[PDB]
Amino acid sequence: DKTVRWCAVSEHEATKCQSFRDHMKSVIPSDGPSVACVKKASYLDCIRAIAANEADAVTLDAGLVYDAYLAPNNLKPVVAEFYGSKEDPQTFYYAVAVVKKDSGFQMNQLRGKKSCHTGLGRSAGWNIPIGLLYCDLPEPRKPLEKAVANFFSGSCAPCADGTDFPQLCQLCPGCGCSTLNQYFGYSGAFKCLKDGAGDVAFVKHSTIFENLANKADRDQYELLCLDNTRKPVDEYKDCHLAQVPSHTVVARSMGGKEDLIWELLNQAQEHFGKDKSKEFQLFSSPHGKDLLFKDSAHGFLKVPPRMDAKMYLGYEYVTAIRNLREGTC
Ligand SMILES: [Fe+3]
Numbered sequence: 001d002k003t004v005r006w007c008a009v010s011e012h013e014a015t016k017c018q019s020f021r022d023h024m025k026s027v028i029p030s031d032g033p034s035v036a037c038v039k040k041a042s043y044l045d046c047i048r049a050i051a052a053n054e055a056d057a058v059t060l061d062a063g064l065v066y067d068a069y070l071a072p073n074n075l076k077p078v079v080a081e082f083y084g085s086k087e088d089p090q091t092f093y094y095a096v097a098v099v100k101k102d103s104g105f106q107m108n109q110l111r112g113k114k115s116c117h118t119g120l121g122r123s124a125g126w127n128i129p130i131g132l133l134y135c136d137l138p139e140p141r142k143p144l145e146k147a148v149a150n151f152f153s154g155s156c157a158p159c160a161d162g163t164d165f166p167q168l169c170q171l172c173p174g175c176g177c178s179t180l181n182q183y184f185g186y187s188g189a190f191k192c193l194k195d196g197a198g199d200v201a202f203v204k205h206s207t208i209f210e211n212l213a214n215k216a217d218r219d220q221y222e223l224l225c226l227d228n229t230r231k232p233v234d235e236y237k238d239c240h241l242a243q244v245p246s247h248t249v250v251a252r253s254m255g256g257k258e259d260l261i262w263e264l265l266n267q268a269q270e271h272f273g274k275d276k277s278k279e280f281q282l283f284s285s286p287h288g289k290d291l292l293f294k295d296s297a298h299g300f301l302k303v304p305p306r307m308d309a310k311m312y313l314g315y316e317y318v319t320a321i322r323n324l325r326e327g328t329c
Contacts, residue, residue: 004257004264005036007046007058008292010178014039016291020268023280027271033264042159042177047073050250056257059293062245062313063123066321069309077248077312078258079265081297083206086274091301094205094240095124097224098193098233105199106228111136113199114171115155116192118185120145123244125189126157129202131320132226132241135329144324156192158184171197179288187211187289193221200224205236206296210289245313247294248303265300274298 008017017037024035038055040046046058051073059081060068068075084090097107105113110133118125130148137147145160149167156171158181169175171192172183179185183192186207193201194211201207212218222230225239249265251258272282283298285291303312310318 005055007055012179012288013291061122075250079249091246095128098201107224116189116198116201117157118189119158120160125202128242
């Protein structure tokens, strides 16, 4: 029955957030939940802000959910996105490696190629791919960024430190950590491949379909499978790197307004969910892709009482992330 300060990362999400606020004002009764928009430069500033009681919520890729839980932030997942459809809700998605047809190389031949990542620490764009190549990277493997920059002959790893790891922003100077960087996120990583800046793009299964509407254009891209073979992009179920947890909304563990967050999102998905309204769309926008929430999401599911980041992500996934920051071969 009160205000939820949503954290928007940069200008594009801020605009979508303002529209979200305005439309909710015209559908929700005077005594219903409302939205306020707090603009920050990166997802990292959003995490600090929430922990500092400057904002209340933000949606994060699962990989980033782990960081959010560590002290002194101690945020917890309260609401998760679900994909697929309302009839068959999927609380996970597939991480894939997209390349152009006949580029002439397999998964075990990535050394020296140029890579495009959605962002440092994210599930599909970093943790899965780098987790699988870990023992392929040259030594020392510490720091991780260092060895990654030496494996590929140039890449775009948004949010990485370009001062110490220049090679990680060769394809996107500055390694901007928001949509101001044309190569940020799923669709940014895809564009990086499409434009020809990189040789491979680590994204999710729906990315190409979200960007190329003619099957004729998609037939010019393939997927790299673990068994060093290539398959068409429609065959991701038989050619993916891993299954990762859906993105989730995080909030403070104390005075986190988790009840209001859910009330707001549940009502938001009622009035503005998929195909629900002509005035405003929660899972789409003319100002960009994957703003505030992923375009591929179909709705929200409440997370069980007091579930911590570790239990939510699962031991397996949480294992991989640890093995990446410590890792041995
Ligand atoms: Fe993701």
